[PDB]
Each structure stands twice: as structure tokens, then as C-alpha cells.
């Protein structure tokens, strides 16, 4: 019932959360996750956020065109034939980012755990 769901998940204790999909409940409190970036691994359920899309006004980390990740705030989303884009504001300026360009720092993901954490 969690299988097939889109999530944002981290795979290290101090790492970032990345978008992906649950492909199997594998037990020992773990889920096999296929990240949009291609990496697949078994992640602890505590490190999975069941939020898709990431909600309005969430603080995220997004990859700008200049190839720097930096913090911004989600201000909207658009789904264009399968693909999700986020509108993210940084210092007053909104740009559109692909789903896989939007990640969460440990603190940013921790903010979402009570509402969207798996368990």
C-alpha cells in the first residue's frame, strides 16, 4: 500500500532527501526505493517522506541553472505530460525546476516528518 508511491527520501543519516518511488516493502523496517536519479537502495522508513508534490510554502533546496543548489520556497507546481515542475522562489525571484532538481536538506526534511513521515 506504500508500494508505487512517490516519496522524498534520504539514504544516509546526515544526508539530503531526494525524490523517488517506493518499489517494495522489504521488512527490517526498510523499503526499496528507486530514486529519480537512478540509484536504488533499501532505505529506513523513518527516512521517507510521503509527500507528493512537496507542498506550497515548503523550504527546499533547488538546483539553479548556474549549477548551484541553494534554498528556496515552493510557490507552485505544473505537471506537463508526466513531468512535474516546481515554481521555487529565491530572494524574491521565481524559476521553474524539474522534480529531480529539488531536494531537501536534513533540517528541511525534518520539518516535514511529523506531517508526512512514513509510519
Amino acid at each position: 500500500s506504500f508500494v508505487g508511491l512517490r516519496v522524498v527520501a534520504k539514504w544516509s543519516s546526515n544526508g539530503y532527501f531526494y525524490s523517488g518511488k517506493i518499489t517494495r516493502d522489504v521488512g527490517a523496517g526498510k523499503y526499496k526505493l528507486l530514486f529519480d536519479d537512478g540509484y536504488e537502495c533499501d532505505v529506513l522508513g523513518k527516512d521517507i517522506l510521503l509527500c507528493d508534490p512537496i507542498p506550497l510554502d515548503t523550504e527546499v533546496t533547488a538546483l539553479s541553472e548556474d549549477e548551484y543548489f541553494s534554498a528556496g520556497v515552493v510557490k507552485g507546481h505544473r505537471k506537463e505530460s508526466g513531468e512535474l515542475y516546481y515554481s521555487i522562489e529565491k530572494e524574491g525571484q521565481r524559476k521553474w525546476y524539474k522534480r529531480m532538481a529539488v531536494i531537501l536538506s536534513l533540517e528541511q526534511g525534518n520539518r516535514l516528518r511529523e506531517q508526512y513521515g512514513l509510519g
Binding site: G15, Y16, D37, G38, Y39, L63, Y68, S70, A71
Partner: protein, 77 residues
Amino acid sequence: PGSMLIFVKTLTGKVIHLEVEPSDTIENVKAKIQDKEGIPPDQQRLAFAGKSLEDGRTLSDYNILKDSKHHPLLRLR
């Protein structure tokens, strides 16, 4: 120390994060990628925004590192 956060995208597409100092050499960064991802440095060609980063320079030599709020994504190729 004055360490800084960078990201690296591997050939598989997997993104990792590293802590680096502005004084680290590219070889040192490859050694950190090796330590985390097991990718031998002999397999590793790094670039930032499409510019090759060559052994024996530092990140600062390339003007890659800014403030602590902007984390560059290096890409392996």
C-alpha cells in the same frame, strides 16, 4: 575548519554530498568520492558547469566555491 558543502553527480545519476575545504585539490576531491562511492580515481573525470577540473588545482583556483548558502554540483564524466 572552514569546510563547505558540494554535491557530485555520478555516471549512474546518483547525487552524493561531500564536505570539502576551499584548499582541497581535485585529486583530494576524487579521493573523497572514492572513499564514499568506491569509484577509483582512475575512472573519475570531474567538471563544474561543463568546465574540466584538472588535477593539482584547488576548488578556489576555479572560482567554484562561493558562500556557504550556494552548493556547487560537480558532475563526473
